[PDB]
Every structure is written in structure tokens, then in C-alpha cells.
Amino acid sequence: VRSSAGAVRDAGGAFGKREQAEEERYFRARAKEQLAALKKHHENEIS
Amino acid sequence: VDLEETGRVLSIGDGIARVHGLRNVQAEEMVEFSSGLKGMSLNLEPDNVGVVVFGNDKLIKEGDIVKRTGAIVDVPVGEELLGRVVDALGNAIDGKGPIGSKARRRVGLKAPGIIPRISVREPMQTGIKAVDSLVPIGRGQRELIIGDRQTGKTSIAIDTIINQKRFNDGTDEKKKLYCIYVAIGQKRSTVAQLVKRLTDADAMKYTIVVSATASDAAPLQYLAPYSGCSMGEYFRDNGKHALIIYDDLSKQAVAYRQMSLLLRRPPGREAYPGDVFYLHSRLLERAAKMNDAFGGGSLTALPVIETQAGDVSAYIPTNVISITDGQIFLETELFYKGIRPAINVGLSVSRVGSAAQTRAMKQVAGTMKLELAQYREVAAFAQFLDAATQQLLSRGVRLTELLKQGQYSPMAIEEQVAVIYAGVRGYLDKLEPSKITKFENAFLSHVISQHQALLGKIRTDGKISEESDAKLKEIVTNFLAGF
Amino acid sequence: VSSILEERILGADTSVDLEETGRVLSIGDGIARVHGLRNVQAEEMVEFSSGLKGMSLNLEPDNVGVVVFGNDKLIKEGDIVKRTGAIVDVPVGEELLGRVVDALGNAIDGKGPIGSKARRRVGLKAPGIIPRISVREPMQTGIKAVDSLVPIGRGQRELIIGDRQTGKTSIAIDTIINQKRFNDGTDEKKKLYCIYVAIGQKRSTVAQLVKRLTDADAMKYTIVVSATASDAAPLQYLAPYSGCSMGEYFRDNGKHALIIYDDLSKQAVAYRQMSLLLRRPPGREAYPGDVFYLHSRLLERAAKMNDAFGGGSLTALPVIETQAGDVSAYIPTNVISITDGQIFLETELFYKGIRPAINVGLSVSRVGSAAQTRAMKQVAGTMKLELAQYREVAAFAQFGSDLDAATQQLLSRGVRLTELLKQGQYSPMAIEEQVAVIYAGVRGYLDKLEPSKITKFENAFLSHVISQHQALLGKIRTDGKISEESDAKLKEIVTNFLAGF
Amino acid sequence: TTGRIVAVIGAVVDVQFDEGLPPILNALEVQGRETRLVLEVAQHLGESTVRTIAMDGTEGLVRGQKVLDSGAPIRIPVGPETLGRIMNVIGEPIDERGPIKTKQFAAIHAEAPEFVEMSVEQEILVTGIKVVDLLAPYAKGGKIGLFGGAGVGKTVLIMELINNVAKAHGGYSVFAGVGERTREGNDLYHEMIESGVINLKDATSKVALVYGQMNEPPGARARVALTGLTVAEYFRDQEGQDVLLFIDNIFRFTQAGSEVSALLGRIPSAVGYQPTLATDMGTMQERITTTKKGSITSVQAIYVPADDLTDPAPATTFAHLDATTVLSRAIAELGIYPAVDPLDSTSRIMDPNIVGSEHYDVARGVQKILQDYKSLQDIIAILGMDELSEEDKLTVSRARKIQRFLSQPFQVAEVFTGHLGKLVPLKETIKGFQQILAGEYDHLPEQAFYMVGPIEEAVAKADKLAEEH
Predict the structure, then answer these.
(1) Crossing angle for the helix pair D352-383 and A14-45, to the nearest 10 degrees
(2) Chain C and chain B touch, per 3+ beta carbon pairs within 8 A
(3) H/E element, C455
(4) Which one of A18, A28, A32 has the shortest CB-CB distance to B380?
(5) What's the total number of domains in chain B?
(6) Are residues C53 and C143 in the same domain?
(7) For the purposes of burial, counting CB atoms within 10 Å of the CB of B428, is it exposed (0-12), middle (13-18) or buried (19 or more)?
(8) B2 touches chain A (CB under 8 A)
(9) CA separation (Å) from C215 to C201, C361, D349, D425, D449?
(10) For residue D182, what are the CA distances in angstroms to B122, B136, B227, B328, D259?
């Protein structure tokens, strides 16, 4: 009897979905700031 | 004695009769016992015939005389069955008199081949906002309905059967959809209540109800779905659309398992015979959509399975999930957290899906799919916001509250489009999450009262014209401010 | 041609004989029920009239249940079955080396016929308790992880267990290829005559395999039996014993052999089919009650004869496949309690980049210190202790910082050793090169070198040692120990090289 | 000869002969049947009896019906006259277009090529699918399997492989649907007619079809596989061509065997499957290998009951494939279509000697990063992403980018997603994944890589997403 790696997501329990939740915060916020920065960049390049 | 056309029972017991004789009896042919009963010669052994008695065998004794009828099992079909409750054989049990049909039809018949069928194109309006929008159903499509006990499966079926009253009272005939409801393994009380609630909606004038309740001998439960499917194939062949709702199918598998373990056939997995696949496939593959050289009929099938403890990976649930063209996963967790009907989206696919829908509803459902998908990605946050994430959570809550629906109150497709368009266009994101319901309800009446012209325009043209969109937006805003 | 056809016709055996006989009562699913054959020995080879074979496996009181060695399409109720009187036997010798034979020792390679002289049974008994002598010599597999942490002596059963596509056949074939250096050299006390039994594989896989072996010119000392997926159940149930008898010939002829069963979980399935069709009572997972006797009487032929019976040997590396690390299933536990070890392979390790994906935590060898050379023993004792220490606290790895400098050292050593154990495919290394690399690894001559580069170092070091200091490696190899002079010389080479890079 | 039916149990008919018995696998024609009913002998019960599995419904069979022994196993038409013609398990047209006028009949029960005939060459095939071409390259003329449960995308993926490889492939092709929905039957038929691979006017068709869709009795689903396989075997050997052979599913074959095994009087094996599962699958899956006379590229859609890859059916089938692409539902519910699992997928030609150092190391970097991301998820589940390291968030972001980048809009999925089909030449997939792993796109958002073809489309999508921001 043993365990595996990357198994807190397969169970789909409470943690399996809270983990998706946490990751999705982090990367939604990062995507927002990255989109703003890319905008800023192209708008600056108009000059 | 004539052992070619007539045999004698050898050992009746527990429902199965061995019959010595009947040398000229066909397989799955219907023998009549001397006491009014009927059978079905299933096993043809070298010495005796294993027959299954369609009823209780109190009246069968060793020595009775079994005499074949000469014709493979068959059931009455026709327009004359509509609005009747019939037994699994075709014997009315509503006490309304003789059934009176002018045409029989075999039950163990063959599904239409590859050429007759044509792709699924028309919509089969279910009247449930959660199905017409996200998991649509087309005519000629088989759409499982799988969920634990008491999650609102027969509710989906009865909403579908009631909703077809809009079209069945109209002038058109390419929109009329007659319905058949096969009740396997239920109670007589439940079937009687179902018929009463159908009559209260005057939805029995175009429905049949094949009833093989719990008490009826196992063979009748095993044979009810085929009888219903044949009564529906009659309409399908003759260019009239149809529908059929097996409820449930797992009970047919149990009845077959009993009937096959009493014939001494060896068991398989979970004691089911090996064929419980070929039992359901043989049945469901009859739900076709014939092309225009074969009439253009159809037979939508809505098999209803019950998983044990939300176990979709059981034997029979996975035997049927791989036979049908989609799913409607009723979850018993969403059924308490508030969502009724408990349809679980994201897991509910419709392998035909979008092509079936109507353009008007497609316009809004396309956007609703994405909005709800994003919401469900970040709907896991009772645990704990950003501007966009907060907006997404709010919009998801609004749309979810819109999906909820009453019971036995199907709503026309134009009204569904109105409400969904209101929700997905941002004209709700300020209302209290728990207010939506009342708003929704009230909103209907208003648009039902004054703007029947706009709903009629959407319904007739089938799409939200730009003028239609403008008028709809004006109504939504003038009401929201008037809310 | 024609002129050759003349003697092809002449070179026949036209004679007839008075032979016993019984007639088939039934047939179907590959199981004839012959009636008659009153004097047929259990487990005997009968021949049907059409031309097939059969092994009269189930002597019932009234009929004998024979199992056909092929499609029974050619057999009919009524055919004649004539007994031969000879238990199943197969050819043996050194004529087979380089050939490909099927379960019954019939060349399926084209390439002419087998010119074997002496045959041998397949149901012999294993050598007793006195003939054997303790396992002492090592079998260099050429794989760092196998050859240092989980050693394999000659005369030892070493299960190679693991899930699907983790590299079990690759380990076996690296082992086969490594023996080339010995089998080209001089001494006859280090020549291993590998055998490879292919069960249940498809002929394309065995063809690719023999292609690999031929490329490395490793066929001149290998036999390749093959009962592939299409060959009826009896030929898969019976191939391992054909291989084991071909190897027993060497073992009792004072030679050293090595037999690789691949898989042994596709022989038990074939035996289950045979039994269930013969109607023998089933058991757990439907296997009969003999699915332990089956394997045990096979893997107990792998012995190491003493010096009075010749001094031969027969290793055995049964490859087993476990369904998602379910080591508790029936066959995995049946074959784990027969053998002297296990080389566990895992996919979490295979995709982390640790290839070969050996899981040193679960892999053990019950000979242990013995079955290693004194040099490899000196290196591997410290390596094994260091790796165990690293494993017991690797859980912290994702943090690393915020922790004591002692555990930081442990992680910085374990990571380096793990990276050193990584190996290529079909690139086995002589023991001296393994000792050199793992010496440079366990003595701290990499702790200051970033892990990502270790592999580079390894290769470079070998190129800088083989082409430069072959004398030192020969000194280590001829006497398998590190004399203080050799130790210091290794230290100097490691230090100066690392400085020069 | 001529025997009589003595018993009819389910879909198994026992026939008693007074003349010489017919050998096993022969075909028997039951007389007096409006539709040709063909039984196959499968046993000799002793006492001049045989037991036979019926290829059509046994309704109406009467104990004592006379049965004619054909003489040879089920024989079906073959040749270039079966191109664009749908066929039954017994090779009789079901497209209502008249008999199949051929010159050669072939018997479905043949033997596998011997070891001396095997071809040991292998070279990559370009399917124009990112994940498949990268992590599991398909050998040309090598058996290929598409595992995965229900509703993950097996049929859509085979539709894509037909759309891409079929037309762009010179030699003929065959599609042998075994026990799958009859709707998909005419969906494929009409799609192929539209593509023009099947023409109902000229003899320019390229694809033969065989159909044992799941409304047929179990006896006729265990053999339609052999019918399609026979047609393709003829196109390989006699026509000296190269062939594509699509099968879907090839698990309904073992299931259809399991359905009738019990009635044949056999103890049931592990999970209710017939005792003879492995060898019945071996005698079929070893008539599909490429040989020295011709080449067959076989793509088989293998069901997996309840997404359990340990089940005996897929567990056995794993040994009969070169490339196995294991579609996963865990990845299909993230919207990453095709649902392929980048870690379960495997191929035999993923060795640097056959794809080169660049491709091999790009693939292994992708796998390493995905596995490391899986390892981190366990921690992110407790910590939350903020408390992570600073070098890790990089790896999680890269893994998410790669995971989204492996999706792709298929040409047949234009009706599901509303997107436009994309193809990606192998070199471009390698370029894109090299760049992502190296960090050259570490500034772009993740949703820039969702459902895009070559990486340049990723940068264009990043722009168009940042504009509307």
C-alpha cells in the first residue's frame, strides 16, 4: 500500500477543487496585469 | 396428441414453464396457455421448450396444454392508442374499453439501417431552461437521464411531455410530437399519479402510457420497453415525429436478469446475463431520424437510469452511457445546494448538441456556455476580490439563479430566450442574487402580457433580429427600471 | 535446385509403425477430448491426423483432454490421435545460439534449420539442496542503479516488476548487450549465454528486438525463444520451460547462462485459459490452484551448481507487469514470494527524468553485499547509505531553504547521486567505469557543481578516463578492489579533471 | 451436406448432422429465411452435433430447420470494386446500390504473417496534431491505439485522422466500424461523400467501409472486425499497395465475444470476460501488422470501461500497439481538446535516433515540466499559490502555458467550438514548445495559448486579447 504524486487533484475532493481555485486566482490576476502591460507596451510603441 | 402444434407443460415454477412438445414452435413465438395466459418460447432445447409466462402462474399446472399462436410476439399500434394506458402486451388497463387497433407490429424488430437515417437537425423543445440552452436535444437523438434516487428525472420527462402541448394544438404537423411513456418497475400508485398529473394538463390526448409496474411478472417488465418502442416506431415510419421515455431502464435489466437466471442460463457480471448490452443497444438503436425518402419521421428516446450512490462507473450505467448520444447528469448534491432541476452542466454533453438548437436560442446560449464555464472555474470560493473576478462571480450567480425552474411549468422557447437574453446581456448584474427568482417570474408575465408581438416575432422568425434585439433590450431596461 | 530436390526427397523416413490411437470425441476452443489412448502418459505429446500436435494434459477416466498446439480448424470430431509416447522435449546445445526458435525449438528464423544433436525434456526437476552453492559471483548488468544499489549475483532470481511502459524490457536488453565484453574476451568463467523468452508479445516487437540485438552484434551468444501473441495458449504456457531447459543445458554443462522471461504474467494468463477450458476448478482471479506451482517449479531451476556438479549457473529475470502499482494482485505476489529480489520500476520516476526508472526504495536484493565486486562494494555501501538518508528527508526538497545546513547538505548530495544514476538506453558500462563515476560522486567531487550539469560531467569524465587512463581502469578491473594507490590516483584524476572544466 | 437445427438458445444454435460434420469456422446457411442467416461453427459437441453462433437475429428459427453447409468459412467480396461500398459482416451491400461485382472472394479467417515476413522499418508519420506529433509520434505502417473512456473524443480524433491522412494518402483505405452507433455510420458516410473520397458516379472512391454497428447480434459484432481486416489484408497483399485501416471500437469485439462465451459453456474468467480473451485478441490483432509485401497503418479506437485502464480488455490490448494515445477525461473537462494525456501517451519511435535530439529533448522537457507541475499541485492545494517559491511559480506558469498550448481546433470540431481547423507541421510544434520551455513567451497570458495552432497565432491572440482589455 502506497501513494502517488499529483493525487490531491485526482480525488476531486474539497482540496482537489480548492487547488484549482487558488491557481485560478493567481493566474487570472497575473493575466490581468500582463494584459495591461502588453497594452501599455503597444500603446507606447505608437510613438 | 399433436406434439407438432401443441405441447404439455412439464414443470411450471417461479414463472418459467418447460413444455414437452411444440415441435414446430418458433423462437420468441407466443404460445397461449389454456387458462387465458400467454407465453414466449425463449429456450428451444432438444427435448423441451422453455417458455416464460406473461403473468402469475398460479393457474398453470403440470399437464396443462400449451398451444402456439403461430406469430412472433407483436403488439397493437396505431393512432388509436393515444390517450390510453396499456399493458406491456397492448391490453388497456384504464377501464376505458377495448383498445381497438387496426394494425399489429413485432417487438423484436430490426432498427433502420445506415441509409434511411439522416443527420439530426430539428429541436425537440424540452421546455426546461437548463436543457434547451446548454444540453439541447434534437429530434432523432437518444439522450440518457442519469442520476441517483429522487433527483428529478421523471420531472424532466413530464416537463417534456407537457411542453409539447404548445405544438400539438397548432396547425403545423411537422412540429407535432406525440409522446410515449414506458413505466418499468414503478408502482401502480406512481403511474396513476403520473396519469392524473398529465390529465390535469390535458397532455393525455396525444400520449400513450405503457405500464409494466412492479407486480407484473418479470417478462412483462422485460418486454415493456420493446412494446413502447414499437408503438413509437409506428409513428416514426409513417412520417409523424414521436418520443419515448423509458423510466427506468435499470429495472428492465433487473427483470431480464431474473428471467434469464430462471431459465438456467449462466450469469455474468453482477449476476446479469452476458447480453445486458445487446439488450439495451438493440432497443436504443431504434431511435432514428428517417430521411425524406422514408417519410421524415423520428423517435427521440430518453432512457432514464438510476445510479447507486452516484456511481456512474457501475455496470449498467456504463453500459447505457456508451449507447446514447449524450447525458443529463442529475446530481443529488446540486439538488440540495439549491439548483433544481439538478442538471449538472459541464458533465452533461449532447454529442449532437448545437446543430439541434434553434438560432434564436443559440445566439444567447453560446455566450451563456462560456460565461458559466468561466464561473464554474472560479465558483469554488465560499472560501474567500478582483474587479473582473468579482464580476464573473456575480454574473455566474445571476445565470445560475436564472436556470432554476419550477415543476410541471415548462416555458415556451421564446420566453426562455427572453429571460436568458436579459441575464446574459448584463441587465441583471445589479439585482440581489436571491431577487432574481421573483424578478424572473414577474418578468415573464409582463412580456407575456404586453409584448406578445415581440415573442411571436422571435418564434416565427426563429432568430433575434436586430430590430427584435432593439425592442427586447428596450423592454428589459424599461422593466428593470420599472422593477 | 532440382538436383538438391532429389536428396531432399531421398532424405526422408518412409517407415511405418504399429502405434496406439484414439479418436476425437469433441473439439472446440482449442481443447480436444480424445477417446481411447488407454496407455497415454499424463503430459505427453500426441499427434492429430491433420498434422497438429497436442499435449494430453487431463487424463479423465473415460476420455483424455488434449490441448491442441494450434488452431483446431484442422481438427474434427472423428479424427485420429496417435500417441508418440515421449513427454514434451526440445532441442538444446550451442547450435541454438544466434537463432530464433519457437516454443518447441523449431527455427522460425528461416536461416536454415537447427543442427542440434541432443534433446532434453521440459519437465525436469530443479537441482536439490546439496548441488547448489551460495551465490557469490556478480552478473554485471551494465546499469548503474541495478549494478550498484540492487546487485544481481549469478544464480539468483531477480524479478523485474513494474507498470506498463516503464522500461523493463529495456533493462533486460541492456543486460543482454552488456555481456558482449565478456563474451568476446577470453575467460570462460565470465561468459554469459543470455537467453530471451518472448511471451505474448507481437511478432513486430520480437523482430525489432532481434534487430536491436543484431545491431549490437549480441546475437552470437543469445537464443531468442518466442511464443508470440498469435500462438495458441499451450505454446505460450510452454515457452518458459523450453527456455529454461535450453538454459539448464548450459548450467549443467559447467557454463553460465541467463534467461529472461517477458512477461511471466502472460504465461499465467495462457495457463488460466487452458485450465478454464479444460474445466479445472478456478480460484482467485479465476486462476487455477497451480498458478503457484506453475511458476515456482520454473523459477526454482535458476541455480548455481557447486564445483562437483560442474560450477555452472542460471540466472533468471522474470519480467512482471503490475496494473497501476497493484503489487498485491495474485500473480505479482505469487512471483514476488518465489524470487530473491525485485527491481521495481515506476512512472513517476520515469517522467521526472530518472531513467532507468528504478525505485531504489522498493527494490531489494536478498543476496546483497555478496554478488558485488570489492571495488563496487566499497563505493556502493556509502552510496546506498547516502541515498537512503536523502530519501528519508526528500519531502523537504520543495523548501530546501529555511532548513538546517545538515539537511541542506543531505539534499545537495542526494540530488547529485540521483543525477549520476541516470543512464542512457543501450549504453551499459563496464564495472570499472561505474566505480570511477560513483567514486567521483560519493566523495564530494560534485557537491559544488550544479545538478543540471552533472550528466555532462559524467559523459565527459568517461571520455577523459577511457581514452587517457585505461591502465588505471585495468588495474581496478583485474583485481576488483581499490588499493590505496588506486584510490589516490582516482582522487587525483577526479580533482584535476574537475579543475579542467 | 445438410443438417438440422436441434437447439436455439439465445443467439447460439446447435445443429445436428447425419452426414460428415463441417469443420470449425465453416459457414452454414439456414434454409427458409427471408434474410440470409449465416451461422458459424464454433464447436463439435460430440454425437455428430455442432454448436454455431448466428450472425443475425434468431427470431423465427424452428427446431428442425434444414441447414446447408457452405464448405468454406464466411467468404466476402474483395477488390477495388468494394471501394465506397458499405458491407455487412458477411460482405453483402447495405447501401442499397446493388451487388458487389467482384472477381475475388476471400475467407475472413486467415493466418497471421510468419516471423520471417515481418518488416522491421519504422519512420515517423505527420498527423498535423500538436500533442500527437510531439509526445507520441505515430510510426508509419504501425498499429496505433486511441484509448480513453466514453465522451472524451475518440470518434472526433479518428474523424480528424481520416480527414488529414486519408485524402493526403495515396493508397486505398478502409473503415471497419465495429459495434458503434449507427448514427455515426451515415455521418461518416455523408462526410466522406462530401469530401469526395467516396463517389457514387465514377470508380474513383478511395475508402471501403464495413459496418457491424451495435444493433447487430453479438455473433455479428465479433466478426465484422475480421471482415474489415480481410478487405484491408487483400489491399495490402494482392494489390501491393499501402493501406490505412481504421477500426472503431475494437473493444466491442471482445465484448461481443464475452456476450456469447457463456452460452458456449465456458467458465467465466476474471471480470466476466471469456476465458480465451488474450488469444482471441491475438489471432486478430496479428493479421494487422505491416509486412514485407505491404504496409497497413492501423488506427484503432479502444474503449475503456469506466475509464479503467487496468480492465482486462485495454490491459491486454496495450501489448498490441506501437503508439498508444490515452485520452483522459480529467484533461477533457479542462477544455483541452484533444483530451490526450501527455504522460500516459507513449510511442515506440520516441528514440532520439528516430526523431533526433531536438525533438526528443523538447518532448522530454515537456513531460518533465508537466510531471513537476503535478508534484507542485499537492502543495498549492495547502499553501495557496502565493506562499510558493519564486522559482516555482515560474514552472507552474510554464506548465500551464504548455498544457493549454497542446490543445488545438480540429477541422471536424468546427461545429462544437465554432473555430477554424488548424494543422501544424512538426517543425513548428517543436519550435513553439522550445520557445515556451525556454521562457521566450513568459510575458504572455495563459489564455493566449488556448485553442491556437502554431505559436505565431499565440502571439496574435495575445495581442487581440490585450487590445480589448
Answers:
(1) 110
(2) no
(3) helix C454-466
(4) A18
(5) 3
(6) no
(7) buried
(8) no
(9) 21, 34, 17, 32, 43
(10) 19, 20, 21, 21, 20
User: In this structure, are C467 and C361 located in the same domain?
Assistant: no
For the annotated catalytic residues of C, the residue numbers are: 366
> Domain check: are C402 and C412 in the same one?
yes
- Judgement on whether residues D66 and D80 belong to the same structural domain of the protein: no
Q: D248 and D157 in contact (C-beta within 8 Å)? A: no
- Residue B300's beta-bridge partner residues? B243
C315 & C380 share domain: no
Taking each helix axis from N to C terminus, what angle separates B387-403 and B436-449, rounded to the nearest 10 degrees? 60
Contacts of D460 (CB under 8 A, 6+ apart): none
Q: Which residues of B touch D151 (CB under 8 A)?
A: 321, 327, 349, 351
* Side-chain half-sphere exposure of C176, counting CA atoms within 13 A: 30
CA distances from residue C241 to A6, B103, C235, C238, D282 in whole angstroms, order as listed? 42, 68, 10, 6, 22
Contact between chains at C273 and D279 (C-beta distance less than 8 A): yes
Of the residues B149, B351, B359, B376, only one is catalytic, namely B351
State the CATH number of the domain containing residue C485: 1.20.150.20
**Are residues B88 and B230 located together in one domain of the fold?**
yes
Q: Are residues C29 and C136 in the same domain?
A: no
Q: Is D247 exposed, middle or buried (0-12, 13-18, 19+ CB in 10 A)?
A: buried
Name the method of structure determination. cryo-EM
D63, D96: one domain: no
D97 is catalytic: no
C96 and C80: one domain? Answer: no
Q: How far apart are CA D231 and CA D288, in angstroms?
A: 11
Residues 6+ apart with CB under 8 A from B213: B183, B185, B186, B187, B188, B191
Chains A, C in contact: 3+ Cβ pairs under 8 A? Answer: yes
* Alpha helix (H) residue ranges in B238-269: 250-261
Preferred mutation among D140, D267, D382 to probe C, highest tally of C CBs within 10 A: D267
Q: Hunting for cell 533493462 — which residue is that?
A: C171
- CATH number (domain holding residue C111): 3.40.50.300
Cβ neighbours of A12 (radius 10 Å): 11
**Residue C245 located in a structural domain:** yes
Q: How many CB atoms neighbour CB C394 within 10 A?
A: 16
What domains can be seen in chain A, in order of their start residue?
Answer: 1-43 (1.20.5.500)
> Measuring CA to CA, how many Å separate C115 from each of C11, C93, D67?
15, 9, 51
- Known catalytic residue at B351: yes
Q: How many domains does chain D have?
A: 3
Residues D40 and D141 in one domain: no
Domain that holds residue D459: 350-467
Residue C150's domain spans which residues?
87-372
B407 marked as binding residue: yes
Q: Report the alpha-carbon distance of residue B259 to residue B221 in Å, rounded.
A: 10
Q: Which residues of A are less than 8 Å from D374 in CB distance?
A: 5-6, 9
